[PDB]
RNA sequence: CGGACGGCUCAGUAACACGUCGGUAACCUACCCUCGGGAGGGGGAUAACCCCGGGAAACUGGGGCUAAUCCCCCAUAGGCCUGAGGUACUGGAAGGUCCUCAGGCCGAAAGGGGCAUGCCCGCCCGAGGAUGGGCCGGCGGCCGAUUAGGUAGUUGGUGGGGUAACGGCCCACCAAGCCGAAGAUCGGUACGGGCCAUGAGAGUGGGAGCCCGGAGAUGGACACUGAGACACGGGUCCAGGCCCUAC
């Protein structure tokens, strides 16, 4: 009978969103708690070793990470267990490389190369709102982060809008609302990695979540959950997507 | 027969001596924490310590150890061995946090089964 | 408060804190319908509902019954023969984790 | 024995060149490490030191083997990154 | 700081133990992430070390001396309870969060270490998340009638206690309810599933080895410390076995 928390992960029990050989070895790296969920993230060791190929062994990868060479959201990360997730930027200045982390049409995480100018912005979806002592407004975002705003501009933010920010200093830019002609990118579900414009929203009683209808870029309609719709623009995306 | 370990605090030295006969049986029923004029045991404290020590230099009992190796515990009364569960000393050196062991110890009062006695030169 | 369902509230006003109308008790989860079978316990009702279970090998169905114990507030005094609406909530006693929220057809 | 370089990568972080090459030896056994290293450096203008050969691998019937090599700039970075067993195997350090 | 994971077995268990769908607006969470804030003033002990040792061993006593990211005190912030108001936030819905006033209880911190002429690693508080758990519900899943009536805190209610938390979990009082031939209760056998063997298939049988979950550490019971244990290489007692002994 287990008497405490887990500290190990077997490869056959790893999440499907990863690109990992399951029958090669017995153990996998167990991610440490952090910004994103376990089903929507992946550690840095795998990005450095198995995705880009800058190393063949975990010792080399750990040396690279501890020398202060990899940035995430503009910050040096040395922990090989740190999880990287959707809409995150991975940058390497000694090679001028910049990648955005996104999902496939299967649900697996890939790196899409971007430019050094767009690598300075990250969109954050608002997941919740709170009042904190002193009468301040706290927005709780999708990566698990938090942001403070004043009481006077509380109506300019809601629980499904998107906020674009300069990532190392975290200053707000270009709020994008949830409306009936907004452009959205789907992150989870069966229609993952699709994009389109909103058409209709539907509410339901007693806990059942709301639903949203979307029109494809060629005329086809589909549906999904309003929590899986990530606003990225008004009529034209504001980041380079695949 | 008793072996005394007499310690001088102002210096930091200690001497070991032996005692027999009435000079020994004058110690029974004496509890830890009692004072005894050294004259009543037949010892010249200045002569053994080799630095002269003045009169009325009455000693005090601190602890001891018995013939089988078990030490005295001031909190237990009587000359009888007991076995009790301990969290601290004397009589138990804990090697872990929150550890408790069932140790056997001797009580306050002195008895012939005791061998070593410890004394502090008091002024 | 007007709760997150769509039924008419009762024309009475209870004062018991264990009521979803007029009280502090809160409903969450599933909600089903059924008929009352017993109303002998104080503020307690037994509810039954029927359903059909498919047997594969023989390609046919059998009828099964389900009993549920529910709380019955005073503003809603349901009796035997009534068709009632019940909702899930926190445990109130050893056997009761459901509460009556509306009567839909009285009996005679 | 003849050599044919198939691919080269630059690793700017660890500070190395990673070389994948083929070795054609028809009618001959698998060549040693000394000869392969001599030829590699003589051709690509690499320091004989600061160059370590990983596996040379033969196949079932090929008369064509494959090879991986690492060329470092400095020797201190080399000794810091690479493990001692390949260094002893190549002969740049003693056991 | 960790040792509560990893590793081993299948005795017990016919049960919300397992599987799937849901809920916690009824709860806890060290290591990790983000944001907002702080680090003021004092004191003390004691291992190591020196002088004596005791004991067959296992182990262990006295005196002297001392430091810290060891221990304690004061302060301030802060946490909790209750009462009266305002209605700013989330949500499907506020015993929830925010603002005002009042009466009270508990009560922080290592400005430390390193490099250097500010940077790195760290300490305490608050709001959220993540990770891991606890609890609840609907549905599903062996054989027996030469096993037919069973239950007495048993079923419910009012008021309380206790818990991290809802709850007959426990208590005082008021009632007589609850399950059952659509098979209760009792007994037998058995870790559960993903899966496996066979067969044209319908179906029949098994479920040790790999993964998820549960339980256990000679049999039984009970506690300390810690974010987390009633603890597989920690503790206490009884029963049943064994080993050393200067007995
Ligand atoms: Zn009512």
PDB file of N, CA, C and O in Angstrom, chain A residues 52-56 60 63-64 67 69-70 92 94-95, chain D residues 9 11-14 16 18 55 68 70 77 80-82:
ATOM      1  N   UNK A  52      15.493  18.308 -30.850  1.00  0.00           N
ATOM      2  CA  UNK A  52      16.425  19.112 -31.630  1.00  0.00           C
ATOM      3  C   UNK A  52      17.745  18.405 -31.894  1.00  0.00           C
ATOM      4  O   UNK A  52      18.382  18.666 -32.921  1.00  0.00           O
ATOM      5  N   UNK A  53      18.176  17.526 -30.995  1.00  0.00           N
ATOM      6  CA  UNK A  53      19.364  16.737 -31.239  1.00  0.00           C
ATOM      7  C   UNK A  53      20.668  17.405 -30.877  1.00  0.00           C
ATOM      8  O   UNK A  53      21.709  17.062 -31.446  1.00  0.00           O
ATOM      9  N   UNK A  54      20.649  18.352 -29.942  1.00  0.00           N
ATOM     10  CA  UNK A  54      21.873  19.004 -29.498  1.00  0.00           C
ATOM     11  C   UNK A  54      22.651  18.169 -28.492  1.00  0.00           C
ATOM     12  O   UNK A  54      23.663  18.645 -27.968  1.00  0.00           O
ATOM     13  N   UNK A  55      22.209  16.949 -28.211  1.00  0.00           N
ATOM     14  CA  UNK A  55      22.899  16.088 -27.267  1.00  0.00           C
ATOM     15  C   UNK A  55      22.397  14.665 -27.438  1.00  0.00           C
ATOM     16  O   UNK A  55      21.323  14.426 -27.995  1.00  0.00           O
ATOM     17  N   UNK A  56      23.199  13.724 -26.948  1.00  0.00           N
ATOM     18  CA  UNK A  56      22.868  12.310 -26.990  1.00  0.00           C
ATOM     19  C   UNK A  56      22.646  11.707 -25.613  1.00  0.00           C
ATOM     20  O   UNK A  56      22.030  10.642 -25.518  1.00  0.00           O
ATOM     21  N   UNK A  60      25.105  15.404 -20.884  1.00  0.00           N
ATOM     22  CA  UNK A  60      25.357  16.532 -21.774  1.00  0.00           C
ATOM     23  C   UNK A  60      24.206  17.526 -21.740  1.00  0.00           C
ATOM     24  O   UNK A  60      24.425  18.743 -21.683  1.00  0.00           O
ATOM     25  N   UNK A  63      24.423  19.522 -18.543  1.00  0.00           N
ATOM     26  CA  UNK A  63      25.490  20.511 -18.635  1.00  0.00           C
ATOM     27  C   UNK A  63      25.039  21.716 -19.449  1.00  0.00           C
ATOM     28  O   UNK A  63      25.267  22.870 -19.061  1.00  0.00           O
ATOM     29  N   UNK A  64      24.397  21.463 -20.590  1.00  0.00           N
ATOM     30  CA  UNK A  64      23.910  22.553 -21.429  1.00  0.00           C
ATOM     31  C   UNK A  64      22.922  23.417 -20.657  1.00  0.00           C
ATOM     32  O   UNK A  64      22.959  24.650 -20.732  1.00  0.00           O
ATOM     33  N   UNK A  67      24.662  25.493 -17.875  1.00  0.00           N
ATOM     34  CA  UNK A  67      25.516  26.570 -18.357  1.00  0.00           C
ATOM     35  C   UNK A  67      24.741  27.837 -18.695  1.00  0.00           C
ATOM     36  O   UNK A  67      25.365  28.861 -18.994  1.00  0.00           O
ATOM     37  N   UNK A  69      21.957  28.404 -21.141  1.00  0.00           N
ATOM     38  CA  UNK A  69      21.868  28.590 -22.582  1.00  0.00           C
ATOM     39  C   UNK A  69      20.458  28.508 -23.146  1.00  0.00           C
ATOM     40  O   UNK A  69      20.237  28.992 -24.260  1.00  0.00           O
ATOM     41  N   UNK A  70      19.508  27.915 -22.429  1.00  0.00           N
ATOM     42  CA  UNK A  70      18.143  27.741 -22.914  1.00  0.00           C
ATOM     43  C   UNK A  70      17.238  28.707 -22.166  1.00  0.00           C
ATOM     44  O   UNK A  70      17.324  28.828 -20.938  1.00  0.00           O
ATOM     45  N   UNK A  92      17.178  30.123 -28.283  1.00  0.00           N
ATOM     46  CA  UNK A  92      18.601  29.832 -28.139  1.00  0.00           C
ATOM     47  C   UNK A  92      19.374  30.929 -28.860  1.00  0.00           C
ATOM     48  O   UNK A  92      19.373  30.967 -30.101  1.00  0.00           O
ATOM     49  N   UNK A  94      22.729  31.575 -28.942  1.00  0.00           N
ATOM     50  CA  UNK A  94      23.953  31.108 -29.581  1.00  0.00           C
ATOM     51  C   UNK A  94      23.698  30.455 -30.932  1.00  0.00           C
ATOM     52  O   UNK A  94      24.663  30.109 -31.623  1.00  0.00           O
ATOM     53  N   UNK A  95      22.435  30.273 -31.316  1.00  0.00           N
ATOM     54  CA  UNK A  95      22.091  29.832 -32.661  1.00  0.00           C
ATOM     55  C   UNK A  95      20.959  30.661 -33.255  1.00  0.00           C
ATOM     56  O   UNK A  95      20.481  30.334 -34.348  1.00  0.00           O
TER      57      UNK A  95
ATOM     58  N   UNK D   9      27.499  18.091 -39.002  1.00  0.00           N
ATOM     59  CA  UNK D   9      26.728  19.035 -38.208  1.00  0.00           C
ATOM     60  C   UNK D   9      27.662  19.824 -37.305  1.00  0.00           C
ATOM     61  O   UNK D   9      28.712  19.332 -36.890  1.00  0.00           O
ATOM     62  N   UNK D  11      27.698  21.729 -33.645  1.00  0.00           N
ATOM     63  CA  UNK D  11      27.061  21.938 -32.350  1.00  0.00           C
ATOM     64  C   UNK D  11      27.791  23.100 -31.690  1.00  0.00           C
ATOM     65  O   UNK D  11      28.895  22.939 -31.158  1.00  0.00           O
ATOM     66  N   UNK D  12      27.167  24.277 -31.753  1.00  0.00           N
ATOM     67  CA  UNK D  12      27.764  25.498 -31.233  1.00  0.00           C
ATOM     68  C   UNK D  12      27.765  25.542 -29.714  1.00  0.00           C
ATOM     69  O   UNK D  12      28.571  26.272 -29.127  1.00  0.00           O
ATOM     70  N   UNK D  13      26.887  24.779 -29.065  1.00  0.00           N
ATOM     71  CA  UNK D  13      26.817  24.802 -27.608  1.00  0.00           C
ATOM     72  C   UNK D  13      27.967  24.015 -26.997  1.00  0.00           C
ATOM     73  O   UNK D  13      28.795  24.567 -26.264  1.00  0.00           O
ATOM     74  N   UNK D  14      28.036  22.718 -27.291  1.00  0.00           N
ATOM     75  CA  UNK D  14      29.146  21.906 -26.813  1.00  0.00           C
ATOM     76  C   UNK D  14      30.444  22.233 -27.533  1.00  0.00           C
ATOM     77  O   UNK D  14      31.518  21.861 -27.049  1.00  0.00           O
ATOM     78  N   UNK D  16      31.526  21.612 -31.098  1.00  0.00           N
ATOM     79  CA  UNK D  16      32.037  20.429 -31.771  1.00  0.00           C
ATOM     80  C   UNK D  16      31.490  20.356 -33.189  1.00  0.00           C
ATOM     81  O   UNK D  16      30.497  21.001 -33.533  1.00  0.00           O
ATOM     82  N   UNK D  18      30.200  17.220 -35.623  1.00  0.00           N
ATOM     83  CA  UNK D  18      29.772  15.829 -35.622  1.00  0.00           C
ATOM     84  C   UNK D  18      29.760  15.337 -37.061  1.00  0.00           C
ATOM     85  O   UNK D  18      29.024  15.874 -37.897  1.00  0.00           O
ATOM     86  N   UNK D  55      32.043   4.706 -32.586  1.00  0.00           N
ATOM     87  CA  UNK D  55      31.938   3.414 -33.249  1.00  0.00           C
ATOM     88  C   UNK D  55      32.394   3.458 -34.703  1.00  0.00           C
ATOM     89  O   UNK D  55      32.101   4.401 -35.440  1.00  0.00           O
ATOM     90  N   UNK D  68      31.263   7.459 -36.993  1.00  0.00           N
ATOM     91  CA  UNK D  68      30.873   8.707 -36.355  1.00  0.00           C
ATOM     92  C   UNK D  68      32.099   9.287 -35.664  1.00  0.00           C
ATOM     93  O   UNK D  68      32.850   8.555 -35.013  1.00  0.00           O
ATOM     94  N   UNK D  70      33.822  13.035 -33.647  1.00  0.00           N
ATOM     95  CA  UNK D  70      33.606  14.314 -32.989  1.00  0.00           C
ATOM     96  C   UNK D  70      34.910  15.097 -32.995  1.00  0.00           C
ATOM     97  O   UNK D  70      35.943  14.593 -32.541  1.00  0.00           O
ATOM     98  N   UNK D  77      37.724  21.680 -23.170  1.00  0.00           N
ATOM     99  CA  UNK D  77      36.308  21.403 -23.386  1.00  0.00           C
ATOM    100  C   UNK D  77      36.092  19.939 -23.739  1.00  0.00           C
ATOM    101  O   UNK D  77      35.122  19.314 -23.293  1.00  0.00           O
ATOM    102  N   UNK D  80      36.416  17.861 -20.671  1.00  0.00           N
ATOM    103  CA  UNK D  80      35.296  18.141 -19.781  1.00  0.00           C
ATOM    104  C   UNK D  80      34.024  17.441 -20.239  1.00  0.00           C
ATOM    105  O   UNK D  80      33.273  16.911 -19.413  1.00  0.00           O
ATOM    106  N   UNK D  81      33.766  17.423 -21.545  1.00  0.00           N
ATOM    107  CA  UNK D  81      32.519  16.861 -22.051  1.00  0.00           C
ATOM    108  C   UNK D  81      32.615  15.348 -22.185  1.00  0.00           C
ATOM    109  O   UNK D  81      31.791  14.608 -21.637  1.00  0.00           O
ATOM    110  N   UNK D  82      33.607  14.865 -22.916  1.00  0.00           N
ATOM    111  CA  UNK D  82      33.614  13.458 -23.273  1.00  0.00           C
ATOM    112  C   UNK D  82      34.000  12.584 -22.082  1.00  0.00           C
ATOM    113  O   UNK D  82      34.789  12.997 -21.228  1.00  0.00           O
TER     114      UNK D  82
END
